Symmetry: D2
Subunit: 414 residues, 4 copies
């Protein structure tokens, strides 16, 4: 079966999926090869991903390869209901995903997905893999391998590995060059601001925007906020990215100092409770807070709800918390990934490369079944580099190649 | 009465109007003085504006001042139907404006507006003022003055003046410092890209974006396109702004040369047929064209429709024209103002200053009734500067002031 | 005769003058017409300019036109001694200008210039014109007109006008579009940072740089400081440019608040005592202060010297003032124009347009002798626009032109 | 003994060395510890480095640690003669380095340095290490280890390793986070443009600048050229950095296409013959070419000299080659590292971290003598991270630290 909002949205979803595919030519080439070679014949697969037009294009590629897939939502607010209807109605792919589903429904979907007995699990944040290892030790025989889309999931998998429970291969998709160099940086940079503007309509120019974290995502968000005229503050816990932020022209300071100054706060750390009650207490009246790291827990919304004497929905995706002293704190997207909650996530141009990595990582797991050591595996260099070559070609860009004399010069030392 | 889509949308419109008001503190101060002083007591007023949350806040301010106002849509795609509902149901202000109305409905609304016998007309593009002068010479005895919001309207007013038919005062709101330095540049820069992204979800980074025109709007569009990672080309007809664009790091070239290279074309010239049939024929497969100047005629869409063998709707706000050779041209928003057709227009932060100028220009017209010469009047300097002082204060920014000795130094030449 | 450092430097000066001429093609075209038409036959001329390779190219053009010219230094630190040598030895043009000359030498040079009995005076800062009006009322019968290169000179001329003593025509070269849109903004933006880096070798990335003033020069300085990775603070006295700086992404605040934070301070206001004793006392240990407005009095160096217990020369163009608490304040170029004191001033590409305006303004004065009203005259629009057309062509940039139907559309209001 | 230009320059060199040390506080702390602990007592050391004020501060730190050092120039045009005089006269350190020395003198200095019988070799480009391994196999017993400052040297060392001749430990200083993230990127970005401007005085705004290579140095040069208003073209041989360049807003193309368009060409590839005769032949008349990669061979100057019918020195650091068809090619710095040839190299702020890595890498080699495997060693993470911590502290920047609960969250997976 399936569990979706409205099957009648399938014609609209089909339209949106085809529009998204215009900038996914690398994944389109992979799909056409998969249709011929059927690498996933007889394989059962579970994908826990954001249910978007880009994920649909990945799901259709795995379907073309013969995979018996089941899809569930990575996050209650990121699901595109028209996409879910199209995958069920047009491709017969079971989808368990409703935009705005409660937590009980989400956990039921994880159980149904584990009952599919997947051989391959594509995960985004590692929730299904963690639940497999904790609750379904008796199913581990099914597992050929798993993949992990995002930085937060990679951290979880390392914790699993160090705990001695990562007893199967897991492909580190996030850390492929063609994933986090583009998706995490340029994709998040544009789509995070997109979500903020779609939720609030606010002018970014002249605002002070605080970016917590200066890794791949933070560099992108700060870069684009600056491009839109914002005064950017960066917070960090490590000195190397902190120095980078300073030399990129941004003001670096502890969050306690930034909390007095920000008009908009954006967390992209992958860590818990980066913005806390002692920070809410000193924020400007009407300060906006939002999260672009995989889990909402980066903002301590639980404490904010306790502190506040009133909460009201002021707009789509926008809630106003009123503190007992009468000052307000505006939260976008209930603290969930603001690019996917309030807009449509990354453009398909960067998801082409992220999901090419997903598709070829799944092919890698099956082709090498019985030959991969348990634990985390990076994407093979040849795969990573071929995705880049294909994407640069599809963007219409030509570059140079080394001559035999230049190759001789590199290998020379005298 | 009125002519709107659905009066049941009024509670939603009220919520949106109040959200937009948060960054209109200057206009709010004017509203509060107007409610005390009633400068528009006994005055009938027509406003032909984009029916947005920002225009609503202007209409409420004129209402507090005593104006007997009637509002019609400047453009069929920019009307926000919940705003129209709120103005009718909560303020008793007649609104003739339905999103998506046809051309005949629009011209019927203009005739209704003129039958209101306004003493003051606020216009955006000067269509109502042109109709008044053309068809209603007998009504000119009613006119205390008019105002004009946008650059294309100022150009039409100059042509009316030179034709000898501008026989009343017209306030040049567009060219106030606190209007086109901010609205036209920073407002359009953000909101134009907002409309493109809401229509297409396209990644701007890595695209070649052609901006036609490097005036106030084109400077803003190019600045923010560059900030979002695009490769920017600028076209021009005048050498001073062309040199500026070169020294700002942009490529400058004729549109015939840009036509082969652009991925996204954005017209902001105020002129007719800037993108032409001979340009469509050489564009890249899947090039996107859109317009952010007041009238759609900047793109020769009539010719495009005759060159195309087929037109498809690919998603909201987006049409795909397929040429006989199979290549596609994408049009956003039917060539209408892309920021207002596909998104919500400028943020309220800059419309605060634009519409503070409108309200104070109307006050200037009434206080000086029977004393102003016919023709175009600029916004008085003391007014323009007071809007800037109030806005800067409302942004929480403090600056310096000259000491008495520094003042003496300025007036010393020895 | 002349008064220069070393005439043996002439071959070196000739080489530098010819290098600078490569990006002065507009002025070269004017020189070639002048040599045919001789507009300055029988005219005596004084030029008080920065004695640079660019001024040399201007002097050569006036010479080709027949001018009996005499050149003196506008500023003791900006004189290039090899340029002075070449103008004397190769062109027989009297030059009174020695790099590093003392104040008494400068004032002696002004007296020599006035004894030349000029009919035309080109001034930069209006010092010679003020001396002429103040001391030489009997010579005013010689004057056909004067010109003024820089913003501070225009301000002094306005004060002369309002005092009733501007009894001849003065051409406002600074405010020509092709002057202060390019020279003042992009020229100063690059050359000011050039002077700072040549004086100090300091990394700009990661520094907080305070720019006093956000007019044409301050916009350029802030733009390029930001481009080099600095955190930029802007101070102002007027709200319109303050809002601009905020929407350009810069922090705006009073200088008293900036004084605690800046690593490098750059004054470009045209006003007196913008950096003050109460600012020195709170600056960071090792803060650098410099001036890029025409006169050094923008920084209160007199007070700094009295607050300091000791001053050391730390390298060329750089002085270290040590305060009693042991903290240091670094002054570049003794507070004189840092681009011209520590480097070579604006690139010749923008001086081409500035000094094309000078040459054509002198021609305008002579062709209209005995016909111009006393007071300030702007550069004629046809002149300003022709300079822009020639410069754009010389940069190899082609743009569009309106078709006949597009022209008709502009003049249509119906 | 020693071999320098002029011992009388020592007072000026002392001044310049002290000025440079103001932004080298990390290396100053290392020097003070070294003065106490004497890690290099009884050690002989050779450094082949650019003989700059920053290298002098490193040499003084090694001297404080008890090292018996000898310094030679890495490059004939980068030597600062006043620094060389100060090291000889004030510290008794043998320096063999004359700015502008011929190739025969440079090779003699390498022989004298090898006759010092070093135990530690600090190299920049690996020339001395290669000569040791090729010519002095009988001295390898002396060697505790070597270090390598730059990317080109690292490539050479890998070639040595793969050839089986890297029979001792070599510290990869270049690839430390606190080296190539800042030095190669932000340092080269500023100092390369500094050198171009000091040599030519050219306005960068409005020029087309071609950057060959988009690694750490290329990203910096392109970023700063764009910050100065240039239209930037990037050439590459690999698709990952090529896609990055596009998404950063730059035009990516093969060098054969860029050769027609560039006004200024900058090579930062580390490879041979990136700009070739077939490229010179299509360049604009007056195109400027320069190199910022360690060796000049990135530009085929040998072929340019053969093709040209004439060469003349048009300015300091600037040569004009005239081709038989009369077009000119301008070369800066004889194709040598333009930041060091025409200016003073990187600011001391970034060399503080690069040379902290050098100093602590030398301490690491001695502390671990007899315990390091032959081959290339990366800088230990704890050393790399401590340099960053110390530099961030000295820049006056404070950041956050993880709470115990955040640490628990990272190590958790369920
Ligand atoms: N919303 C999206 O579409 C999207 C896309 C990609 C990744 N992500 C998520 O974004 C987050 C960040 O990913 P990334 O690739 O940038 O990771 P990263 O490892 O590259 O960077 C994270 C950075 O945050 C810093 N940091 C950690 N804790 C911090 C704290 N308390 N305060 C300040 N800085 C802190 C770290 O020092 C590091 O520099 C993860 O949750 C990842 O899954 C979201
Ligand atoms: N969409 C919005 O919200 C919005 C906001 C403000 C203004 N506008 C409109 O935007 C347009 C531009 O206004 P502006 O204030 O920038 O005007 P402007 O007068 O300051 O600039 C227009 C520029 O376009 C150039 N130009 C004219 N015809 C051209 C052509 N054929 N090709 C290339 N360049 C050409 C002109 O030389 C000029 O530099 C007007 O139609 C105005 O009404 C729209
Ligand atoms: N060094 C150069 O090569 C060079 C080149 C051009 C002009 N200039 C000089 O630069 C100065 C500025 O010229 P401009 O064209 O930018 O002038 P402008 O009139 O366009 O701008 C000056 C700005 O400074 C602001 N200001 C004035 N007093 C201030 C104060 N006390 N604190 C802060 N802001 C203050 C004004 O509000 C204004 O916005 C003048 O002295 C001019 O002669 C120097
Ligand atoms: N001048 C300075 O002060 C300074 C400072 C640091 C490093 N360097 C030198 O700069 C050079 C580059 O160093 P890096 O750290 O940026 O190296 P890197 O390995 O990070 O980057 C080099 C880049 O050039 C590209 N490339 C190689 N051959 C090419 C070709 N033929 N055409 C185009 N692109 C090509 C590679 O794909 C790579 O992306 C080296 O020679 C290094 O020693 C100089
Ligand atoms: N349009 C999208 N569709 C699917 N996944 C997305 C989209 N935008 C972002 N993501 C992914 O979501 C992850 C965070 O949960 C990121 O690693 C990113 O790859
Ligand atoms: N949010 C908005 N509400 C009302 N008018 C707008 C909005 N955004 C842009 N405009 C105005 O529309 C005019 C163009 O028709 C511009 O001059 C601008 O002032
Ligand atoms: N290279 C230069 N040669 C001559 N004058 C210059 C140069 N650079 C700046 N100036 C001029 O000096 C004036 C300031 O005194 C500026 O208005 C500017 O036009
Ligand atoms: N100021 C400087 N002093 C010494 N070495 C430098 C300087 N600037 C750049 N370099 C170094 O030169 C190397 C290239 O030969 C780079 O790796 C860089 O670390
Ligand atoms: Cl493949
Ligand atoms: Cl008011
Ligand atoms: Cl001419
Ligand atoms: Cl240490
Ligand atoms: Rb979508
Ligand atoms: Rb080599
Ligand atoms: Rb709205
Ligand atoms: Rb010069
Ligand atoms: Rb130096
Ligand atoms: Rb966790």
């Amino acid at each position: 079966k399936y569990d979706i909002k409205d099957i009648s949205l399938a014609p609209q979803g089909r339209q949106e999926i085809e529009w998204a595919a215009r900038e996914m030519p690398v994944l389109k080439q992979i799909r056409e090869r998969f249709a011929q070679e059927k690498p996933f014949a007889g394989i059962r697969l579970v994908a826990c991903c954001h249910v978007t037009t880009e994920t649909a294009n990945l799901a259709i590629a795995l379907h073309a390869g013969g995979a018996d897939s089941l899809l569930i939502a990575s996050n209650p607010l990121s699901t595109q209901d028209d996409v879910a209807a199209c995958l069920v109605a047009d491709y017969g792919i079971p989808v368990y995903a409703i935009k705005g589903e409660d937590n009980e429904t989400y956990h039921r979907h994880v159980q149904i997905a584990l009952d599919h007995r997947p051989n391959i699990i594509i995960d985004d944040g590692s929730d299904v893999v963690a639940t497999l290892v904790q609750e379904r030790q008796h199913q581990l025989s099914d597992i050929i391998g798993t993949t992990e889309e995002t930085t937060t999931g990679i951290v979880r998998l390392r914790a699993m590995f160090n705990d001695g429970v990562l007893t199967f291969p897991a492909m580190n998709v996030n850390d492929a060059d063609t994933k986090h160099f583009y998706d995490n940086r340029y994709g998040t940079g544009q789509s995070t601001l997109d979500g903020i503007i779609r939720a609030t309509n606010i002018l970014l120019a002249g605002k002070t925007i605080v970016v917590a974290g200066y890794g791949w995502c933070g560099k992108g968000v700060a870069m684009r906020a600056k491009g839109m005229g914002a005064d950017v503050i960066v917070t960090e816990i490590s000195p190397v990215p902190a120095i980078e932020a300073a030399m990129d022209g941004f003001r670096v300071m502890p969050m306690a100092e930034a909390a007095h100054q920000g008009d908009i706060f954006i967390t992209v750390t992958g860590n818990k409770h980066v913005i806390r009650p002692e920070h809410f207490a000193v924020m400007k009246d009407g300060a906006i807070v939002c999260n672009s790291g995989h889990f909402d827990i980066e903002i301590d919304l639980k404490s904010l709800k306790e502190q506040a004497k009133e909460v009201k929905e002021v707009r789509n995706f926008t809630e106003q918390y009123i503190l007992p002293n009468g000052k307000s704190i505006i939260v976008i997207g209930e603290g969930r990934l603001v690019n996917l909650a309030a807009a449509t996530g990354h453009p398909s141009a960067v998801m082409d490369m992220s999901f090419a990595n997903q598709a070829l990582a799944c092919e890698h797991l099956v082709k090498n079944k019985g030959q991969l050591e348990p634990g985390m595996h990076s994407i093979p260099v040849e795969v990573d580099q071929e995705i880049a070559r294909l994407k640069l070609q599809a963007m219409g860009i030509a570059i140079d190649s080394l001559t035999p004399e230049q190759v001789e010069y590199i290998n020379s030392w005298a």
